[PDB]
Nucleic acid binder design. Structure first.
Ligand SMILES: [Mg+2]
Ligand SMILES: [Mg+2]
Ligand code: NA
Length: 316
DNA sequence: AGCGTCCA
DNA sequence: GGTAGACCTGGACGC
DNA sequence: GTCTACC
């Protein structure tokens, strides 16, 4: 298929969004375990599926440049303002990150030192279905392997979009695509391990027991506490996966996912121990306490602060 | 040399 | 509710 | 990281 585009080579096909590097660093956000569907197919150019279409993104110092491959056999053209609005919404650019960074660093000198090096780590606003099933795949696993699982999931069950170079892009699967009684065994052949049952069972649960796709909108509109509790009914979704979905797709900025990294960070960088449990190792109680600790430290956007330290810890 | 343990 | 241990997969890497 | 089984 046609080539992945670069900004310098095809400038007619790109349009810009005002966005300084202090507000966004694509190389620190897109491969850091929020979305698993972006790839740096050319140096400094990131390609992936965003609102049912393939996009490539690249930055200059003050602008985010975007290009869209529409693949309806239409003539190539730069993104329209309406199309760019989807990219603006995905990166939540109405939130001003430099002001959050000032607050987090003011209350936390360790955060301040990390943030000096890791500018522009913000939170994507993801589709709830893509986020739910990607994070069901993430538990007790590593980002490289999760990325391959999500890719093969989309390849097998999501609609084909377009081919660029040797890469065939697919949309994320629907609930209905993942709900069949044959889907689990297929996802096992695709190497999802014991999470194959969780993906298929969770799709069935949403369709058969929760009212379908509208339930995720209910949870978007619900409090953090109510959305967090409700998600945990799903097979494979415990408190960490539920917090990932709350933070990254249901607009709960205070949700703080607590994984192996955040636990290591708490111990190493904060010398933290739980005070609501005599036993100090990970447990339902101590994981709950740690998320409350980070919220008390960083404030209402504590989950966004978590994403900064998580991105940095993947690099260290 | 590559098995087998650690780890995400 | 607290606790312990099993668990798919496959890269890192000590021995 | 979540599940299941046992206290
Ligand atoms: Mg054309
Ligand atoms: Mg559950
Ligand atoms: Na420090």
């Amino acid at each position: 298929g046609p080539g992945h585009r670069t900004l310098a080579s095809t400038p007619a096909l790109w349009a810009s969004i005002p966005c300084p590097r202090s507000e966004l660093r694509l190389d620190l956000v897109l491969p850091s375990g929020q979305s698993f569907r972006w790839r740096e197919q050319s140096p400094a150019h990131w390609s992936g599926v965003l609102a049912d279409q393939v996009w490539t993104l690249t930055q200059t110092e003050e602008q985010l440049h975007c290009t869209v491959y529409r693949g309806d056999k239409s003539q190539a053209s730069r993104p329209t303002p309406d199309e760019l609005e989807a990219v603006r919404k995905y990166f939540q650019l109405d939130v001003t990150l430099a002001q959050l960074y000032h607050h987090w660093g003011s209350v936390d000198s360790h955060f301040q030192e990390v943030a000096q090096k890791f500018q522009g780590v913000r939170l994507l606003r993801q589709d709830p279905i893509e986020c739910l099933f990607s994070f069901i795949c993430s538990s007790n696993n590593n980002i490289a392997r999760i990325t391959g699982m999500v890719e093969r999931l989309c390849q097998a069950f999501g609609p084909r979009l377009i081919q660029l170079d040797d890469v065939t892009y697919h949309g994320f699967p629907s609930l209905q695509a993942l709900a069949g009684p044959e889907v689990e065994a297929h996802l096992r052949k695709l190497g999802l391990g014991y999470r194959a049952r969780y993906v298929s069972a969770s799709a069935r649960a949403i369709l058969e027991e929760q009212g379908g796709l509208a339930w995720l909108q209910q949870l978007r509109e619900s409090s953090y506490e109510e959305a967090h509790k409700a998600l945990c009914i799903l097979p494979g979704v415990g408190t960490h996966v539920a917090d990932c979905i709350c933070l990254m797709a249901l607009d709960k900025p205070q949700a703080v996912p607590v994984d192996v990294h955040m636990w290591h960070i708490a111990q190493r960088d904060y010398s933290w121990h739980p005070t609501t449990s005599q036993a100090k190792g990970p447990s339902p109680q101590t994981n709950k306490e740690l998320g409350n600790f980070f919220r008390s430290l960083w404030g209402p956007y504590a989950g966004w602060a978590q994403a900064v330290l998580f991105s940095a810890d993947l690099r260290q």
